[PDB]
Design a protein around this ligand. Sequence first.
Ligand SMILES: O=P([O-])(O)O[C@H]1O[C@H](COP(=O)(O)O)[C@@H](O)[C@H](O)[C@H]1O
Ligand SMILES: [Cl-]
Ligand SMILES: [Mg+2]
Ligand SMILES: [Mg+2]
Ligand SMILES: [Mg+2]
Ligand SMILES: [Mg+2]
Ligand code: NA
Lengths: 242, 242
Amino acid sequence: GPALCLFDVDGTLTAPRQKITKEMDDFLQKLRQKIKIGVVGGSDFEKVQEQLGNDVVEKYDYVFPENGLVAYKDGKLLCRQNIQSHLGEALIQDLINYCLSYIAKIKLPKKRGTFIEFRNGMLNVSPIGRSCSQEERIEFYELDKKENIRQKFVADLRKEFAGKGLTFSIGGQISFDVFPDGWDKRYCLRHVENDGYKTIYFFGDKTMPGGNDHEIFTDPRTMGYSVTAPEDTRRICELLFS
Amino acid sequence: GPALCLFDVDGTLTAPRQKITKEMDDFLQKLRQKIKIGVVGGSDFEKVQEQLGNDVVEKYDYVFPENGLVAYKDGKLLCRQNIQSHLGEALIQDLINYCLSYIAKIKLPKKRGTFIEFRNGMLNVSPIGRSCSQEERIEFYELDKKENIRQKFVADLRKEFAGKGLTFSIGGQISFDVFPDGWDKRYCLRHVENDGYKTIYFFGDKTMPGGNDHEIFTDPRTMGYSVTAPEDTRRICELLFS
Ligand SMILES: O=P([O-])(O)O[C@H]1O[C@H](COP(=O)(O)O)[C@@H](O)[C@H](O)[C@H]1O
Ligand SMILES: [Cl-]
Ligand SMILES: [Mg+2]
Ligand SMILES: [Mg+2]
Ligand SMILES: [Mg+2]
Ligand SMILES: [Mg+2]
Ligand code: NA
């Protein structure tokens, strides 16, 4: 029936760490006369504006920055959500308080700063601290492969907080992430599932496990299409919609 | 012998939270023809550049951002030291671990992120979290006037870490600073002392007990002069050097 084309932004409509090109922006604006188009990325609205232009809200039918925690539909803000409002201040504080108390008892070679990074969609907890040098990151990534610091911290947090709808995910070199269950790229589906689309195509490049596109690709509500670069996204869209 | 004029920036050359006037900026350059001049502030280099010009390192013979933990002389950066190297990783970790366990026990309306911010010449500690929004910032500032949160946290710290060579200072709205003893504005004199000068004048608008210009006004190496605004600094300098 009526369909929607949802795109990951980085890697799919744009080369990594690069702004959209005038040729792809035009391709999509022409594909917009055929089908309704929308974008989803984990970055704030200011980075989505640096990657797709400061007029993104008027050129895409849907804009879902921050995995859809911020949503725009037809030029207006549809919704706004953040981890503090969903989970409540009490539970937010109980999690921060356990994490600070826990990190204070970890015997590490070095401890720097920003042990807790409050993002609108998650909490990025660092035993060492995100403010550390790159040489200190590596020093902790190797000490963690031996003493399994992040694993034990996440396992004690899973035992104390996870019945409150919380997921814990070790990743990177120095931190793990604490987000409400389902606040990956899948969160954006709840603003398009009620708009009457018989099929919702989705295009992303990190569509294999451990990727930021994987969960939205594996969801039954999407017709997922893995991609490798923006030229490949224009290749598949020509084969699909003429 | 030769002399040097050290100036506070905010409130001494500039008005509160303002750029320098082109009148005062051109007066200081007519004084440089007759005496080497310098500037010193608590702000990062980029904030001193926004107040005095992007070419400050070439308009002034000495430029001492971060109270001198970052120091420029005749355009080139001078040897540098940081809070980790001076205090040691053990005291650092012991202060961080103590501050973290203390913050986990404060009952606040809201807690967010970046409770500890590792800077070159100090550790900034926010009971609420530095990442807090402007609304959450005012909220904690007004509560702390009533409950004296910052005040009690600094009193406990002065006790637990007595004799360890650390000073504590509540400034602003959401935080307090912890710096090595002597790392106030006096730190910068280590780069101008025994450099040929027989007199080192200083000018500051906050030279009273508890101000950021106090210890460098009362330090014996200096010839302190207390000012009220940019126009008063002009008056004293025209009295001394004209
Ligand atoms: O307000 P905050 O917590 O961001 O605090 C900010 O300002 C304070 C002084 O500010 P003022 O002299 O204007 O009172 C500084 O001590 C502090 O390091 C800085 O983070
Ligand atoms: Cl922190
Ligand atoms: Mg991508
Ligand atoms: Mg699917
Ligand atoms: Mg001042
Ligand atoms: Mg003096
Ligand atoms: Na800055």
